[model samples]
Target chain A: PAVVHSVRALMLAERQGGSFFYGKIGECHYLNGTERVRFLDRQIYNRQQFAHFDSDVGKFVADTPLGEPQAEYWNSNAELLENLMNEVDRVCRHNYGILESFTVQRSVEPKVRVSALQSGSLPETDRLACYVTGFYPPEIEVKWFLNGREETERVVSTDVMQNGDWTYQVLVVLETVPRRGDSYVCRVEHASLRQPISQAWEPP
Target chain B: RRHVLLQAEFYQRSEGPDKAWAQFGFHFDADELFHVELDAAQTVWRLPEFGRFASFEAQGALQNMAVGKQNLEVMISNSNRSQQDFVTPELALFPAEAVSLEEPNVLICYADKFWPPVATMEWRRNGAVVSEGVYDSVYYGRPDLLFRKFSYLPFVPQRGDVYSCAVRHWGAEGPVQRMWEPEVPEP
Candidate 1:
């Protein structure tokens, strides 16, 4: 995943007709540390997105159908448009570095467990299941191996699931015939891990 | 009879027998009524978060959970197990400053009107999901008994490109989605 720098401000007001000035200001940063700075100055009214100044056109645009009138009138004012265009730097650029410093990366470690189970699919085979839960940064890797061999054909996995705890979980299964002399292992790889972790089962 | 809305959700990972949980709680506008917790082996109602929940009524609800717990646990086992995901993520490409595509800009995805326990959010470019430099926020409990969360994916805005903030919520049927399409006209 590419690194994204970001910020936000929620500005709300009740009046469509008033002299009071209220709306969110601009903020800048980059995506993947590339040239992706955006000017997101928004006009929000009554807790809804109303309009925004399209940096390309240097005019306001409507976010909703009902906001066309407000956006049209806002765009008609050349003086205000220039001021806002100037403001792209005033507010957003002024605070760009500040917003950049605010983003802190996070990671969570998964609590993993493995157990043996009766195979649900084939009557002749047993199942070895790995449960990896409560991990973070969303993406992860899980695999199953039979002794020194990659058991690709017998391995099955669930999607990385969000655990409502800002973490993720997954379940992987390996199915094979019983054998006391063989060893089976389930391994995981995540960004936070110093080395890949594995758990093994020996038929008892 | 009083009008009561109870949201009950039970879930377990596919083929992971012990990876399961069930929850029952009353819904409201702010905070919530209460959540019932249980101990499966004991099959008894547990205290509300170490006295986090009060016993306003008699032992009736607790006893009710004693039976409901088994039903939930059975629901966990007897059913054809499956898996699904989501969370809704809203994206508004708001720049802290006004500029062309040269400077850095932030794209934010807002997730609202969801239940407790934070949901997972991901940012997508073009169409594929990206996993790095994405920011997560603490859950905001709105006054009306709902939860809100935010994730920020910052990048330079360009024309003809699409970005997405997709969330996997616990109870929603599919991903709660929002897209940020730049308004610039392509040449």
Candidate 2:
């Protein structure tokens, strides 16, 4: 029997019309001839698509003019979208009450292994764009790296909700583009387990 | 002809073997006390918590083959005695009666009356129609036969719950059906 593992990332858009991907990524182990070993594979998956509407759309739903989903503007601004997705990933991994943990004793351990990533072209600028996302449970830590380095400011986070089970997840968006070797990693840690885990992605 | 109806009292109870927290009584019966020895795996009996039963095996002219007695007129005799649980036709154990009421949520039944020791009471549920309440089976202990396993439902017995009790015996015509109904106070 071989151990299965994978790491994936999704991008969060800043403005509108950006590809919002959400899903899982990671690596798995297998035996070809006769041996067991560990391996890592990057698997990018789908997420909630971005939708944007003007202020007129907001007036129809909210008493105050809350804007409608503006996803298209995100394509033109990839850096902003990536930053947002990263922040969401951070909150999900940190805020305790946001994500409920079953098997309470084992809660301090890392649980989520899913990620979503996205990227787009700017109309005028030569700069490339990228966005990465995923959810994190409480009592865990989330961090981002550029070309194998940590990222600090210029990132934002927001709360996300869903239907059916009516559960909530955190969304962090980090929008940025670095040198050719520049990549992003969302480092995660918890108390129940001794080792920390991380997921990295590239900008399209 | 007025004759002495020799009655031997018996006590017994049963419970589900699955629950780990279940506690039961332990005791013994001799001198013809209405009881039979059983394994702890079968039933539980404790002393002081319960009392002795009466045995009907004595020197005298017998009117009916002495059937054992449990609490509250509940008897544990052979099924052949009554027209219930017919094992063979024309060879009933005569005069002894056993009845059972099996409902959707209850298994209240009465057993035969045999002296010193005789039949045992049990309730079956599930596809076989058992109780879903907090109570155990009828023969979970050696309490008074007075109240053999009855009331195995959440509702105490109001409106529309049903149960059927059957009396199985050696040589009876047919099994008797003793339906169980809870006493309801007019609202």
Candidate 3:
């Protein structure tokens, strides 16, 4: 099939103080590094709906009622999920070397820009967008400030996103009706920077 | 003897009733293994056991694997959310150069900055579908998180020929088409 959007695979395993093991693959969660035998809630997304299997409660729960076919699909997948957990158990045991060998150290500096878009009715408010791109290691902090004071309300941010080049980017937008003297700033902090960087936007 | 294995490990730490906590780890491919730790100090990677068997023995390969960690972290962090928003794309259709019957010319259809990253481009000649000699580049992510792709058609252009590039994207109400016609000089 023609490439639409990239599909990603994920696997995670962690050990806490003495004998506790937790792991995740895609959306499946595991406990004690053992699958089928030990499990956590499995969150599943199909189409746009959210549903989960809470092992502790031993039931299927969903934010909204599942579509008929979706409900039937989940009901019939219990055996399939159990088999997958067994496979995860086998993979974890065979790959024990992964525990000591794990590390996460990729960092790329972000390229930041601030721009304004005018929208809305009679008295239009300028939507200030802070675009940050080409960064790695998503432990990033993005904040909006108005004349040196932090602004929280009316600010929305998109989660960090992966690009084809393996870098990440994010957008933070601030909506406000500009006053002549008002100043807006976007501050970004990431592992790649010695100090947090700030970009300023002034109303025209 | 050569042996290949796949492995993935996640590392998590918590101490003294939530005094401090951290998480990071390693994922393996068919021929290579990588180590990923979040903190600057933990970024150091140990050599793989199969170093002698794979290209991972090289410094470049090692660095690439380390960078792979960042990709994994970003994917993991945002795995639960969709990063898509609707945005219209800009499309253009052009020829590589002046038309000639003796030599082959390439018709290019370019699409850029569309969201959801799901779109298709088709090439048509004189209002009829032309499927041969078509090549397309894979979708690439732009700095703005939108995507871009291109399609090419190699053909010999004749005078009065009309060619079109049709683009179908999620944001558009219908397929957007652009045409290219050979510009004949006036005597």
Candidate 4:
């Protein structure tokens, strides 16, 4: 089995938005529509090189001041660069429908659970959680309210996640350490629900 | 008269031997009610003189015969065993803040996509195992035939501390462990 380090191919349409080029290889963003190309100098691939496309010379130029091996490699692949620039527009337009079809939205209801953090019989702290899960389309709003007013800060929300059944979930947490008498509420709003759902809990 | 029904599911890895993977309620109508591993087959039914389960040999024979029949039926047909994969789950830990000093926080460990739909969770603080403030949900089955589970831990954050969540499943070679540590701010 061959170990694949990275592979990159990018196509962009200036007409769709602003004129820009975005290219990614593995976890690193290596190319932007500009003439400059970047690579990670982690020494894993042995080439700590920065490359730039010289439109005047019709070739790639090594911008990294010293003897970098990757510059030569990029310089020799000028023909490949030309081919990428030429085909990106046609390729993007041809695959436009297939790409758009993937974003088809589906709706699902969410299941919510709220519980106290208990170590034993005693509550651990003045913290509560509203777990909203099994919803679809992934976008949701989970708000925290303190004594009927929405708390602007310190309300933490987890990233939207898949429920493995084509649905999604998220967690909204409220920390009420200072104000014990205030009532806390976890209010959820999503596309699937006809009305917003709220669950309230008081501190012990 | 109360009825006792048993359902058995036998699954095997591509290069592995056929094994009974799951068993539903034999004493009642509940699904996912009981799961007995091959090594612990004897524990499924109690002895006749010792407890309520009568004739262990007869019940075992009937259940084995049922699974054997089901296995033969699938083997003779277009056994989709090649399409099946015993995939190990990917685990991730999410916390509200990247680092916290003294405030209470929530840690959620998510395990996604493993077949046969069963998973177990464990929590550890520092090097030793900690059971308090740990809560886990039942494995939720997906339409894609995989399973997902979430485990939660709520605790006060401290500096220079380590927390780990370990997930155990049949497909994994060992437990999949995810670690979290509070970030220390530079002075």
What is the TM-score of model 4 when looking only at chain B? 0.55
iRMS (Å) per candidate: 25.1, 40.3, 20.3, 27.1
TM-score of 1: 0.40
lDDT of 3 by residue, B58-177 (tens): 232234334344433433333332333456678866554434454687777768777544568888888999989786654443433344666878888787678999888754668878
Number of clashing pairs per prediction, in order = 36, 108, 5, 0
Residue lDDT tens for model 3, A1-204: 011111122221111111111111222233333333322322222112234444444444454442233334555666644544443344333333233223123457888887765564444555787888777665588999998899889899876653323346788899876677887889999989999989988655
What tier of docking accuracy does candidate 1 attain?
A: incorrect
**Which lDDT tens digits does candidate 1 get at residues A115-178?**
6665555453476778887676567988887777878888888766443334456888887665
lDDT for B44 in candidate 3 is 24
lDDT for position A63 in model 2: 14
Looking at model 4, residue A73 earns an lDDT score of 51
Tens digit of per-residue lDDT, candidate 1, span B111-170 = 765543347787889999886767665454343234566676767767667887778865
User: Model 2: how far is A42 from its true place, Å?
Assistant: 51
Candidate 2 vs candidate 3, DockQ winner: 3
User: Which tens-of-lDDT digit does each residue in B94-187 have in candidate 2?
Assistant: 0011111232322223342321112232333222555354332222222222112222233333355444544433223455444444332221
- Which pairs clash inside model 4? none
